PDB file of C-alpha atoms in Angstrom:
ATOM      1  CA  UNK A   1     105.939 143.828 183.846  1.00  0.00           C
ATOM      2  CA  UNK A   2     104.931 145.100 180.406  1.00  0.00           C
ATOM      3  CA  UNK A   3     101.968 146.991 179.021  1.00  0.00           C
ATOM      4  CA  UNK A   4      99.062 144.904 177.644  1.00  0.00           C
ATOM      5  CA  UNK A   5      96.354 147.472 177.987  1.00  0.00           C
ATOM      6  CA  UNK A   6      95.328 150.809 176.371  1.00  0.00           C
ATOM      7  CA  UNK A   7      94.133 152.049 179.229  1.00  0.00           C
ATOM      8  CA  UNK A   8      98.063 151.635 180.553  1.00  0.00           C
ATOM      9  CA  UNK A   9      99.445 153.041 177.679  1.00  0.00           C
ATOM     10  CA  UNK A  10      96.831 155.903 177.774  1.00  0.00           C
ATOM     11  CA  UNK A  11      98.536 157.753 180.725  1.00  0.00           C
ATOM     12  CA  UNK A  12     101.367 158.913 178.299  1.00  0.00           C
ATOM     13  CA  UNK A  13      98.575 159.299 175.638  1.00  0.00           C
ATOM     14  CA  UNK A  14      98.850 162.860 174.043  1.00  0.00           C
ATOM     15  CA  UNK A  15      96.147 164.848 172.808  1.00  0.00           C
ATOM     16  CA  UNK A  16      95.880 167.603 169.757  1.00  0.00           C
ATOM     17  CA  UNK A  17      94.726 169.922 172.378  1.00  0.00           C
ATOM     18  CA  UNK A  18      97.309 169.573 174.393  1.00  0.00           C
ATOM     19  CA  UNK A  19     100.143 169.007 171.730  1.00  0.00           C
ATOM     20  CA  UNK A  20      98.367 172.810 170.399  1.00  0.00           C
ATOM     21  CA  UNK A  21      98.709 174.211 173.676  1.00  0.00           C
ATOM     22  CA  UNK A  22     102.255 173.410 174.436  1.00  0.00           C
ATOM     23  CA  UNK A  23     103.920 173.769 170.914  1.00  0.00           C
ATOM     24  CA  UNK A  24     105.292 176.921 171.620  1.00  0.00           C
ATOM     25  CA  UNK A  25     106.830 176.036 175.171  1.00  0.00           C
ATOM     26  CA  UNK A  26     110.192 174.842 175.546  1.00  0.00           C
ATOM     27  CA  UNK A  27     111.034 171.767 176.370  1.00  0.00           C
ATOM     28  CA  UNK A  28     108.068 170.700 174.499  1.00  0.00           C
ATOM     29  CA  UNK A  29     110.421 168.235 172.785  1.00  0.00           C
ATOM     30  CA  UNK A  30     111.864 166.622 175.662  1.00  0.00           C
ATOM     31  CA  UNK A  31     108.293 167.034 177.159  1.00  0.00           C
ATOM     32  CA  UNK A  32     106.235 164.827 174.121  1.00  0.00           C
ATOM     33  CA  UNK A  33     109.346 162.520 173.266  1.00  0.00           C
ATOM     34  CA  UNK A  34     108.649 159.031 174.397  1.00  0.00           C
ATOM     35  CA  UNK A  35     104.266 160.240 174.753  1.00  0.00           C
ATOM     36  CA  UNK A  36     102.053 158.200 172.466  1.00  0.00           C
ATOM     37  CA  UNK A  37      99.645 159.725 170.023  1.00  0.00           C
ATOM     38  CA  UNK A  38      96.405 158.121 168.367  1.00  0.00           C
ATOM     39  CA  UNK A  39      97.293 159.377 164.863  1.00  0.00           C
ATOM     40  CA  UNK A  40      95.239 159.939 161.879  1.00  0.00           C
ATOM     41  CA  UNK A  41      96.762 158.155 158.844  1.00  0.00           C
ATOM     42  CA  UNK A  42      93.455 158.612 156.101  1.00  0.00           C
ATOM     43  CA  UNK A  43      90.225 156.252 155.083  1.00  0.00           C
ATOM     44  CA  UNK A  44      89.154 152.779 155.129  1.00  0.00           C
ATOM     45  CA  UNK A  45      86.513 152.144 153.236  1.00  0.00           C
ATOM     46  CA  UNK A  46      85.595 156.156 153.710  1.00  0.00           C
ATOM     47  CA  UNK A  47      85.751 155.749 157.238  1.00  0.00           C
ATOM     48  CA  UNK A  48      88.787 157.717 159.469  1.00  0.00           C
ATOM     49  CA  UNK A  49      91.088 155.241 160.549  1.00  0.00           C
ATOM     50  CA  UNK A  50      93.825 155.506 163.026  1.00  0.00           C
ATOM     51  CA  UNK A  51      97.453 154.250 164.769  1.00  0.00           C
ATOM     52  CA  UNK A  52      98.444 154.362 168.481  1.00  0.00           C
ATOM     53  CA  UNK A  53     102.441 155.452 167.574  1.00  0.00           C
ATOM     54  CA  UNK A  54     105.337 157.029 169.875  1.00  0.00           C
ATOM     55  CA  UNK A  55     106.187 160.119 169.428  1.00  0.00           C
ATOM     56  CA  UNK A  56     110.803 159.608 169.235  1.00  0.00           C
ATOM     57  CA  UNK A  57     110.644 162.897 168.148  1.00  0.00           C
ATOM     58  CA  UNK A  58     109.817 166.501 167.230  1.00  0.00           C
ATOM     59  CA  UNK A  59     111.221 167.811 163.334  1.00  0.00           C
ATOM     60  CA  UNK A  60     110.985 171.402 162.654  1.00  0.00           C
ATOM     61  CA  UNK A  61     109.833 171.843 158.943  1.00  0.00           C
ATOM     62  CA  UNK A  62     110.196 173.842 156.230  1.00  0.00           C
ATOM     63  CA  UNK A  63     106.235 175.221 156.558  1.00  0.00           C
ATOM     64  CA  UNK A  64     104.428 176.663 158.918  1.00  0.00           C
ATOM     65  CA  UNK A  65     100.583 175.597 159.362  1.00  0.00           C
ATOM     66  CA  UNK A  66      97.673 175.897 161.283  1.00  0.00           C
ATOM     67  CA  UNK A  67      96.574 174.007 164.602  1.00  0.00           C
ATOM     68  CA  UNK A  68      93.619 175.001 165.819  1.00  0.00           C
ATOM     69  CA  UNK A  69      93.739 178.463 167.532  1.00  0.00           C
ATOM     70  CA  UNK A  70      97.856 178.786 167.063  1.00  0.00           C
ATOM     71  CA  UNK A  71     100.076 178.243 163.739  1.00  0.00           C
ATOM     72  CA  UNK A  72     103.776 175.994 164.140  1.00  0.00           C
ATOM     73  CA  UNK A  73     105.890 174.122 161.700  1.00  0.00           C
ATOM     74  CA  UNK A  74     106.369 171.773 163.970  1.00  0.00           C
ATOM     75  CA  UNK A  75     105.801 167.657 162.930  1.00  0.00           C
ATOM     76  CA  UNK A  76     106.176 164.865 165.289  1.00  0.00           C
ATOM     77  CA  UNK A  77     108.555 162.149 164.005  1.00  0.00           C
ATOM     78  CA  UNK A  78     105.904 158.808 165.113  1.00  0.00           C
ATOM     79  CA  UNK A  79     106.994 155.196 165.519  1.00  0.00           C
ATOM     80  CA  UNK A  80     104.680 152.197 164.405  1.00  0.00           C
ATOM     81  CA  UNK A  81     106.688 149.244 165.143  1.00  0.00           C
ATOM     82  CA  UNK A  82     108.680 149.253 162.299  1.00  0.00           C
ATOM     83  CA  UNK A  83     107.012 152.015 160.609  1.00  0.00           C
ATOM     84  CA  UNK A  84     108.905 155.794 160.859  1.00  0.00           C
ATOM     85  CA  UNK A  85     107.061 158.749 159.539  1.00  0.00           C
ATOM     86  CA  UNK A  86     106.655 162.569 160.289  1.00  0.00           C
ATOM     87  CA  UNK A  87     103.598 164.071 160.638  1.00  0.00           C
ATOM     88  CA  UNK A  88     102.436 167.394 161.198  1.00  0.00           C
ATOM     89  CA  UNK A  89     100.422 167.616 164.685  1.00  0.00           C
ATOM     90  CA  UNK A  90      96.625 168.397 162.890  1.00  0.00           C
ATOM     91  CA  UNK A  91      96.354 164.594 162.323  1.00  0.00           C
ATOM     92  CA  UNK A  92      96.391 163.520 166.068  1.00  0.00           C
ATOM     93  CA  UNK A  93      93.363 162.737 167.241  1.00  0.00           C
ATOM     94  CA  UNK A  94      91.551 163.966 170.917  1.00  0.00           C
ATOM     95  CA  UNK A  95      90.370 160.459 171.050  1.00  0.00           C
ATOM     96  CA  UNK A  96      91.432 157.393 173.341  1.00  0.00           C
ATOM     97  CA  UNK A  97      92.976 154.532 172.126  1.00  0.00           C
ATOM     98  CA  UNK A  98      90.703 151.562 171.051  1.00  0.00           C
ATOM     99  CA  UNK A  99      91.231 148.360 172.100  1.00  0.00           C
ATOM    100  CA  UNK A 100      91.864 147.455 167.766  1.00  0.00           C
ATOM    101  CA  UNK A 101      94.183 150.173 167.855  1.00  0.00           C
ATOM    102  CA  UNK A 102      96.137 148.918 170.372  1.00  0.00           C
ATOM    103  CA  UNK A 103      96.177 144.976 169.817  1.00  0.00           C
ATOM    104  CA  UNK A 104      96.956 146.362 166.155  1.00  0.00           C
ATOM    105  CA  UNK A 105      99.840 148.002 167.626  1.00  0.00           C
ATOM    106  CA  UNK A 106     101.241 145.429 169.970  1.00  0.00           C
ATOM    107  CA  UNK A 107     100.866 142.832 166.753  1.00  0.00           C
ATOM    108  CA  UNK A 108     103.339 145.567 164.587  1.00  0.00           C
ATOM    109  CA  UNK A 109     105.604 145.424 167.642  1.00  0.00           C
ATOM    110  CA  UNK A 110     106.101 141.897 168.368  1.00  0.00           C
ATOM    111  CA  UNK A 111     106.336 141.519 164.077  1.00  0.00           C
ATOM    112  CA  UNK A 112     109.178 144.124 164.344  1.00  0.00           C
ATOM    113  CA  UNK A 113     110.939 142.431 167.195  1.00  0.00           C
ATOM    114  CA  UNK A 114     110.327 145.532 169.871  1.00  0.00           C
ATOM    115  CA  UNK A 115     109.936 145.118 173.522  1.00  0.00           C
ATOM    116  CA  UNK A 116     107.217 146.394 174.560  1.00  0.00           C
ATOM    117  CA  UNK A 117     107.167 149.615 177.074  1.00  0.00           C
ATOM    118  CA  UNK A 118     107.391 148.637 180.722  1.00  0.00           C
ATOM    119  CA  UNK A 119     104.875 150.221 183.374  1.00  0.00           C
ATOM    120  CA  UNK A 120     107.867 152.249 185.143  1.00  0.00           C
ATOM    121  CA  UNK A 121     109.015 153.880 182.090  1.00  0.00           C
ATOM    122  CA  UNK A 122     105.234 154.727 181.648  1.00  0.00           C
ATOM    123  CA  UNK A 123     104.680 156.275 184.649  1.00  0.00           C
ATOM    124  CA  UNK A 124     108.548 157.271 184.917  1.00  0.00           C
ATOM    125  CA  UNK A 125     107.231 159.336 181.997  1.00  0.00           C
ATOM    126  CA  UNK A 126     104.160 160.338 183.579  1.00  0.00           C
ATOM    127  CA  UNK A 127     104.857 161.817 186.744  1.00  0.00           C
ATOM    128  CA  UNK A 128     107.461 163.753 184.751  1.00  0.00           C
ATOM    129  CA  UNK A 129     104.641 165.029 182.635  1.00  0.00           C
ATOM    130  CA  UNK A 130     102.990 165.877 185.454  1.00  0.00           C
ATOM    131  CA  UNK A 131     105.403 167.555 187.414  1.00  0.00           C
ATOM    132  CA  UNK A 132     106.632 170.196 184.756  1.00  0.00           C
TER     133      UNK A 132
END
């Protein structure tokens, strides 16, 4: 069956710390594609607010920046339902996924007409995570 709960969808849930420490690795693309981030997109009412998005891929850019202790001009390409942007790896967030984020992000995906992710993909993707 298909995910319904964060705490599902966080075992594929990649942090900036860990996104910092493998940027330089290859295979870090085939590695983070299909993960999920908790991504910072600015302020609500000057309060950070965030989106749980998949990462469908990894963009090399024109500029190289810091993150954290190492520098990379590396930007993940992140999927909100319908929404498609690049960002650059600073703006994921250590953080879990709230339960708002998430019910926010199932809402964008049944609006845009996308399946949800199954549990076997998830932990296809896991255990694949895991292994390497």
């Amino acid at each position: 069956h298909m995910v319904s709960l964060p705490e599902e969808l966080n075992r594929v849930r990649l942090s900036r710390h860990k996104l910092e420490r493998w940027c330089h690795m290859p295979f870090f693309a085939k590695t983070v594609t299909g993960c999920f981030v908790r991504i910072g997109i600015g302020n609500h009412n000057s309060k950070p607010v965030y989106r749980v998005a998949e990462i469908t891929g990894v963009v090399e850019t024109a500029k190289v920046y810091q993150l954290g202790g190492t520098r990379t001009n590396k930007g993940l390409q992140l999927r909100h339902g319908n929404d498609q942007r690049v960002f650059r790896l600073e703006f994921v967030s250590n953080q879990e996924f709230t339960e708002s984020e998430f019910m926010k992000w199932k809402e964008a995906m049944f609006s845009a007409g996308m399946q949800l992710p199954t549990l076997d993909e998830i932990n296809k993707k896991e255990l694949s995570i895991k292994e390497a």
